[PDB]
Amino acid sequence: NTRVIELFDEFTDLIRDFIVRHEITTPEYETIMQYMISVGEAGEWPLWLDAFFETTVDSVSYGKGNWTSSAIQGPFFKEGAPLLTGKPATLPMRADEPGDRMRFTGSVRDTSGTPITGAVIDVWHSTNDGNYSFFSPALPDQYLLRGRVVPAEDGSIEFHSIRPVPYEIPKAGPTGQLMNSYLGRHSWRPAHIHIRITADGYRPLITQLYFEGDPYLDSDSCSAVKSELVLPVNKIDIDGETWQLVDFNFILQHN
């Protein structure tokens, strides 16, 4: 209420000032209004807002230091994921899964460098097909390439899955329309894998990890890229199946 008065008026002055400086004409104004009505008539608001701004909303709420870097949450988020204690600890995947086989390896330590046994690491990512879990007419609503993973008591974590590939935001919806058509660019996101991490007495982390030589690194449609988060790739041909091995050392909050 007093906070919204502050921002709202500060916001207002700013847009008005934009209209005045750029002499926004009526047809223009009307084209914006129609456009916004679009975005809402589809369901792309969270899509649209997260794609341009949440990278910034994250660089403020969490912070910007040796905390291992934060990345956008993203509409695709998994709630109530399944616990995993598998043999080499695979993620749930439809049999004879296309895509490169992938192995992630890493840790959960803090400031000091001592493991935080009480951690819970939630992971999710798209198919090689370019479709996420739950929501796509081509996929069941059932937990696939999503899950919750506990670290070892020394800290270390590991899981198997498949190698994600760059997803493009629909070339056809208002957001894509903007990225592709009117702005004349691309709506591709670099191949990434999502991560959340919970604990007792630690601030939660939410982020992504990308890959080296990812074509859309230096042009993420959602601007969620940092340097600290681009992973080194180890190409190993366990023959028939070719493998991709990756490492990461997640550090955390501290309440």
Ligand X SMILES: Oc1cc(Cl)cc(Cl)c1O
Binding residues for ligand X, rule: CB under 6 A, are 47, 50-51, 74-76, 167, 169, 189, 194, 222
Closest distance to ligand MYY from the beta carbon of 56 (Å): 9
At which residue do the structure tokens 């991490």 appear?
A: 197
- Residue at 251: amino acid letter: I
Burial classification of residue 145, based on how many CB atoms lie within 10 Å of its CB (0-12 exposed, 13-18 middle, 19 or more buried): buried
Please state, in angstroms and rounded to a whole number, the distance separating the CA atoms of residues 10 and 239. Answer: 61
Closest distance to ligand MYY from the beta carbon of 35 (Å): 4
User: Which position among 59, 182, 212, 228 is part of the footprint of ligand MYY (CB under 6 A)?
Assistant: 182
User: Which position among 13, 17, 18, 118 is part of the footprint of ligand MYY (CB under 6 A)?
Assistant: 18
Please state, in angstroms and rounded to a whole number, the distance separating the CA atoms of residues 69 and 59. Answer: 9
User: Which position among 77, 155, 183, 205 is part of the footprint of a second copy (CB under 8 A)?
Assistant: 183
The three-state secondary structure class of 160 is: strand
Counting residues that bind a second copy (by CB under 8 A) gives 47
The three-state secondary structure class of 248 is: strand
Per CB under 8 A, residues contacting a second copy are: 1, 3-8, 10-12, 14-16, 18-20, 22-26, 28-29, 32-33, 36-37, 39-41, 45-46, 49, 52-54, 56-61, 178, 181-184
